[PDB]
């Protein structure tokens, strides 16, 4: 075989070599000790990992049976969940004690970017998205409407560009207002006695709050740029009258640069497809290159930014997004390592070991600098159900730290609140990680998937779009904020909210996503560097720190509200509405899955039934498949409806896609990808907690097997 024996484990050769030859050198960790620790940790923790998974199944069985035996008593339901151990006692008030955390996390409110780690180009751009051009983000998106005269063309449109300039001028007025007048009338900027002076047509003025002046570049009397700060976030006005845009500007302003993606989550979970050692190694290698600073795709990582202080001295700001890594959760095994019985090893355990080992490089000098200067490794742990599962993650990290010779608590945990049993036990979950937690985040897409599967037997659910605004989800959002603030997260840890999936609807995002920081979230998720820059605007308009202060002590969600099942009312839909829902889900499912199975792409932009481009990953797939499963289970639709829609949408997806692409139609059953999509719906009710990995992984491996022979 092509495996390496270490104790009871048989490690795929490609993974063994990668760890030894690429990851271990420079960590000062004895290799034999590392591998012994791998075997030991896997041996010691696997039983509890299995027990926790079995507990999920047992609880779901009882809940399924509860709905089945009744013909909607919140009182009785709540007592039942208590009896079975689903709803646990709430612990007394406490405050988290997490330490050694960077300011980007404890203090700074701003955008958080998530990107698939298996795509080096995207990962690189994402790390570099700490700073982004506001002009490019406005000009290149629909935030400036493409009305007549302002449409995008092959070359620069001054009507459009002038609207960009004015938009940003208004942003400056709103964010760092002048003592008198408006940035729109500025004719120049200078630094005099350490104070920013803005020349206006018939006078000059300073800032209403001179403390917002953070620095400059070039000569004080004719700067190349001016640096401002507001709500802890930097804004840089680039000055160059000799530039394409600058020459058209009254003050020669070239661009406005926003500090944007303050942190970035490098994702090994829902936005990547990795089903064997080869895929995991591609991912691990990228994570390694990021932490060593030498990833090159040839584009590379940016250096820090140099500035002159108001007084005349020097300082630097970080050029890169502070990096988290999202490990997989407790569910899946992977055959990258198997034991002597041929049993696959739990992937979550493997990720802790390997991504933790690799992260050590980010704690030390890059030959090309330092991810975490405070000495922490930031791991987002997804898809946990309840406080015991959180405690298990903490014990896993404790054991890994021992293997890696790291101080206890080095490996921090970003807790996704994205499963119902975590939501309804959130305080206890936070308490279980009280010395490790660096965020809680409402992963609302997974949470919706879990909502549907948990009450699968209850009755038919409301349509997917409707889910987005159901009582249960709004309560879940407020409850998360309440719990975090009560645990003392303000100034200590991030309170985060979810992803904006409509990658091209930036005007809509700028209009609507402002609700997130208004709700007291100190970060929320964006799909791209461009969206990070635009979402940053919201943090300039809302003072999140103040909002969190104002929410202190408030309790705005009850357990009854959290437990309100999103069942549909009688006669809710006309036939065309049902057909729309089916087609919409089938389109999104097929569009995502075909690239997953045939190309190993874990995140794709897929137009919905309204031609809206949506960023799809396993969470959104979890919702679509579970919703159709639910409708099939309750007779809203038939298996022929599902068949018809999948077959209808298949050619449109073939059309949307080429090169490595293999069309699904007309020979649907020759397409493993098409059969995968079908399986996800038809077997959806039987998947543990409605998770999509078991099917996707089986089918992707099947496809590789055929393409290989």
Ligand X SMILES: Cc1ccccc1C(=O)CC(=O)C(=O)O
419 lies in the binding site for ligand X (CB under 6 A): no
Q: At what angle do helices 347-359 and 277-292 cross, to 10 degrees?
A: 20
Binding segment for Mg ion (CB under 5 A), chosen from 154-162, 359-367, 405-413, 614-622, is 614-622
* HSE-CB for 155 with a 13 A CA cutoff: 1
Alpha helices (runs of H) in 528-574, residue ranges in sequence order: 529-541, 544-551, 559-562
Query: Which of 39, 102, 351, 418 touches ligand X (CB under 6 A)?
Result: 418
List CB contacts of 82: < 8 A, sequence separation 6 or more: none
Query: Which of 501, 530, 585, 692 touches ligand X (CB under 6 A)?
Result: 501
Q: What is the set of active-site residues?
A: 326, 617
Query: Which of 456, 619, 627, 681 touches Mg ion (CB under 5 A)?
Result: 619
What mask, x for binding Mg ion by CB under 5 A, covers residues 516 to 555?
---------------------------x------------
Could you tell me the CA-to-CA distances from 68 to 63, 92, 519 in Å, in that order?
A: 9, 35, 38
Q: How long is the chain?
A: 709
Whether residue 301 contacts residue 367, with contact meaning beta carbons closer than 8 Å, is answered with: no
**Shortest Cβ 445–ligand X spacing (Å):** 3
Residues 409-428 that bind Mg ion (CB under 5 A): 418
**Shortest Cβ 129–ligand X spacing (Å):** 15
162 lies in the binding site for Mg ion (CB under 5 A): no
Binding segment for ligand X (CB under 6 A), chosen from 397-405, 615-623, 686-694, 698-706, is 615-623
The one of Mg ion, ligand X, none whose footprint includes residue 543, by CB under 5 to 8 A per kind, is Mg ion
The three-state secondary structure class of 222 is: strand
**Shortest Cβ 446–ligand X spacing (Å):** 3
The one of ligand X, Mg ion, none whose footprint includes residue 444, by CB under 5 to 8 A per kind, is ligand X
**Shortest Cβ 443–Mg ion spacing (Å):** 4
How would DSSP label each residue in 258-270?
EE--SEEEEESST
Minimum CB distance to Mg ion smaller for 12 or for 176:
176
Whether residue 264 contacts residue 321, with contact meaning beta carbons closer than 8 Å, is answered with: yes
Query: Which of 86, 307, 397, 444 touches ligand X (CB under 6 A)?
Result: 444
498 lies in the binding site for ligand X (CB under 6 A): yes
Alpha carbon distance 247, 156 (integer Å)? 13
- Nearest alpha-carbon partner for 396 in 411, 380, 415, 378: 411
The three-state secondary structure class of 277 is: helix
**Shortest Cβ 416–Mg ion spacing (Å):** 6
Number of chain positions touching Mg ion (CB under 5 A): 5
The one of Mg ion, ligand X, none whose footprint includes residue 255, by CB under 5 to 8 A per kind, is none
499 lies in the binding site for ligand X (CB under 6 A): yes
Binding segment for ligand X (CB under 6 A), chosen from 42-50, 356-364, 516-524, 611-619, is 611-619
690 lies in the binding site for ligand X (CB under 6 A): no
Beta bridge partners of 604: 616
**Shortest Cβ 527–ligand X spacing (Å):** 6
DSSP 21: I
Q: At what angle do helices 618-633 and 672-682 cross, to 10 degrees?
A: 60
620 lies in the binding site for ligand X (CB under 6 A): yes
Alpha carbon distance 444, 289 (integer Å)? 31
Alpha carbon distance 182, 205 (integer Å)? 10
The one of ligand X, Mg ion, none whose footprint includes residue 499, by CB under 5 to 8 A per kind, is ligand X
Minimum CB distance to ligand X smaller for 310 or for 527:
527
Binding segment for ligand X (CB under 6 A), chosen from 20-28, 191-199, 389-397, 443-451, is 443-451
445 lies in the binding site for ligand X (CB under 6 A): yes
Joined tokens for residue 563: 């437990």
What is the Cα Rg of the chain in Å?
A: 26
Using the structure block, give the residue that is written with the tokens 């729309």: 580
Query: Which of 102, 104, 389, 446 touches ligand X (CB under 6 A)?
Result: 446
617 lies in the binding site for ligand X (CB under 6 A): yes
SS3 content of the chain, % helix, strand, coil (to 5): 45, 20, 35
Distance of CA 522 to the CA centre of its chain: 14
443 lies in the binding site for Mg ion (CB under 5 A): yes
Minimum CB distance to ligand X smaller for 110 or for 498:
498
Residues 242-261 that bind Mg ion (CB under 5 A): none
**Shortest Cβ 539–Mg ion spacing (Å):** 10
Number of chain positions touching ligand X (CB under 6 A): 17
Minimum CB distance to ligand X smaller for 24 or for 524:
524
Alpha carbon distance 647, 663 (integer Å)? 12
Neighbour-count burial for 517-535, b at 16+ CB within 10 Å, e otherwise: bebbbbbbbbbbbbbbbbb
- Nearest alpha-carbon partner for 289 in 112, 102, 124: 124
What mask, x for binding ligand X by CB under 6 A, covers residues 523 to 542?
----x---------------
Alpha carbon distance 466, 83 (integer Å)? 31
52 lies in the binding site for Mg ion (CB under 5 A): no
What mask, x for binding ligand X by CB under 6 A, covers residues 117 to 156?
----------------------------------------
Binding segment for Mg ion (CB under 5 A), chosen from 102-110, 255-263, 407-415, 442-450, is 442-450
How would DSSP label each residue in 96-131?
----S--HHHHT----EEEEETT-HHHHHHHHGGGE
485 lies in the binding site for Mg ion (CB under 5 A): no
Alpha carbon distance 464, 205 (integer Å)? 53
Query: Which of 252, 443, 529, 600 touches ligand X (CB under 6 A)?
Result: 443
Query: Which of 264, 271, 376, 410 touches ligand X (CB under 6 A)?
Result: 271
Query: Which of 126, 536, 619, 649 touches ligand X (CB under 6 A)?
Result: 619
Distance of CA 175 to the CA centre of its chain: 27
Whether residue 417 contacts residue 392, with contact meaning beta carbons closer than 8 Å, is answered with: no
Binding segment for ligand X (CB under 6 A), chosen from 134-142, 203-211, 343-351, 614-622, is 614-622
114 lies in the binding site for ligand X (CB under 6 A): yes
255: enclosing H helix or E strand: strand 253-259
User: Which residues here bind ligand X, judged by CB under 6 A?
Assistant: 114, 270-271, 418, 443-446, 498-499, 501, 527, 603, 615, 617, 619-620
Summarize as ranges the residues that interact with Mg ion (CB under 5 A).
Answer: 418, 443, 446, 543, 619
């Amino acid at each position: 075989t092509d495996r390496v024996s270490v104790g009871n484990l048989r490690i795929a050769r490609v993974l063994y070599d990668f760890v030894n030859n690429e990851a271990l050198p420079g960590t000062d960790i004895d290799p034999d000790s590392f591998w012994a620790g791998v075997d030991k940790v896997v041996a010691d923790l696997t039983p509890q990992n299995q027990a926790l998974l079995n507990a999920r199944d047992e609880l779901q069985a009882q809940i399924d049976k509860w709905h089945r035996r009744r013909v909607i008593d919140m009182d009785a339901y709540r007592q039942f969940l208590t009896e079975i151990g689903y709803l646990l006692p709430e612990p007394d008030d406490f405050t988290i004690t997490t330490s050694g955390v960077d300011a980007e996390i404890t203090t700074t409110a701003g955008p958080q970017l998530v990107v698939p780690v298996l795509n080096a180009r995207f990962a690189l751009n994402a790390a570099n998205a700490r700073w982004g051009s506001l002009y490019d983000a406005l000009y290149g998106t629909d935030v400036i409407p493409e009305t007549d005269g302002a449409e995008k063309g092959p070359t620069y449109n001054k009507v459009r560009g002038d609207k960009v300039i004015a938009y940003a001028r208004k942003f400056l007025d709103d964010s760092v207002p002048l003592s008198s007048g408006s940035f729109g009338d500025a004719t120049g900027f200078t630094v005099q006695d350490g104070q920013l002076v803005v020349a206006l047509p018939d006078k000059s003025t300073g800032l209403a709050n001179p403390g917002q002046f953070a620095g400059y570049t070039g000569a004080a009397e004719s700067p190349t740029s001016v640096l401002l700060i507001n709500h802890g976030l930097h804004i840089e006005i680039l000055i160059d009258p000799e530039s394409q845009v600058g020459t058209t500007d009254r003050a020669g302003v070239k661009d406005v640069i926003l500090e944007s993606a303050i942190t970035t989550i490098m994702d090994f979970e829902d936005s990547v497809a990795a089903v064997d050692a080869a895929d995991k190694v591609l991912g691990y290698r990228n994570w390694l290159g990021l932490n060593k600073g030498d990833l090159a795709a040839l584009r590379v990582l940016n250096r820090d930014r140099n500035y002159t202080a108001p007084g005349g001295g020097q300082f630097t700001l970080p050029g890169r997004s502070l990096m988290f890594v999202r490990n997989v959760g407790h569910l899946m095994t992977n055959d990258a390592i198997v034991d002597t019985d041929g049993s696959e090893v739990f992937e979550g355990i493997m990720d802790a070991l390997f991504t933790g080992l690799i992260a050590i490089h980010g704690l030390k000098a890059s030959d090309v600098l330092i991810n975490s200067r405070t000495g922490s490794i930031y791991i987002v742990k997804p898809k946990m159900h309840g406080p015991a599962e959180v405690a298990f993650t903490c014990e896993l990290f404790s054991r890994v730290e021992d293997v890696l010779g790291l101080p206890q608590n080095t490996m921090k945990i970003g807790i996704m609140d994205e499963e119902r049993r975590t939501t309804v036990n959130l305080k206890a979950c936070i308490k279980a990680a009280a010395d490790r937690v660096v965020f809680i985040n409402t992963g609302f897409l997974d949470r919706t998937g879990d909502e549907i599967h948990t009450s699968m037997e209850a009755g038919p659910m409301v349509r997917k779009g409707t889910m987005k605004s159901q009582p249960w989800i709004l309560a879940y959002e407020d409850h998360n904020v309440d719990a975090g603030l009560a645990a003392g997260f303000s100034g200590r840890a991030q309170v985060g909210k979810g992803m904006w999936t409509m990658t091209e609807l930036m005007a809509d995002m700028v209009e609507t996503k402002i609700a997130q920081p208004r709700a007291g979230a100190s970060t929320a998720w964006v799909p791209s560097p461009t969206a990070a820059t635009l979402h940053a605007l919201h943090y300039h308009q809302v003072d999140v720190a103040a909002v969190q202060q104002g929410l202190a002590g408030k309790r705005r969600a009850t357990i009854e509200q959290l437990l309100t099942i999103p069942l549909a009312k009688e006669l809710a839909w006309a036939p065309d509405e049902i057909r729309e829902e089916v087609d919409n889900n089938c389109q999104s499912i097929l569009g995502y899955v075909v690239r997953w199975v045939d190309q190993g792409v874990g995140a794709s932009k897929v137009p919905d039934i309204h031609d809206v481009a949506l960023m799809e990953d396993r969470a959104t797939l979890r919702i679509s498949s579970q919703l159709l499963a639910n409708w099939l289970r309750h007779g809203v639709i038939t298996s022929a409806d599902v068949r018809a829609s999948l077959e209808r949408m298949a050619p449109l997806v073939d059309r949307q896609n080429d090169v490595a692409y293999r069309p699904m139609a007309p020979n649907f059953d020759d397409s493993i990808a098409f059969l995968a999509a079908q399986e996800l719906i038809l077997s959806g009710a039987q998947q543990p907690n409605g998770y999509t990995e078991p099917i996707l992984h089986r089918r992707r491996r099947e496809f590789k097997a055929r393409a290989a022979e």
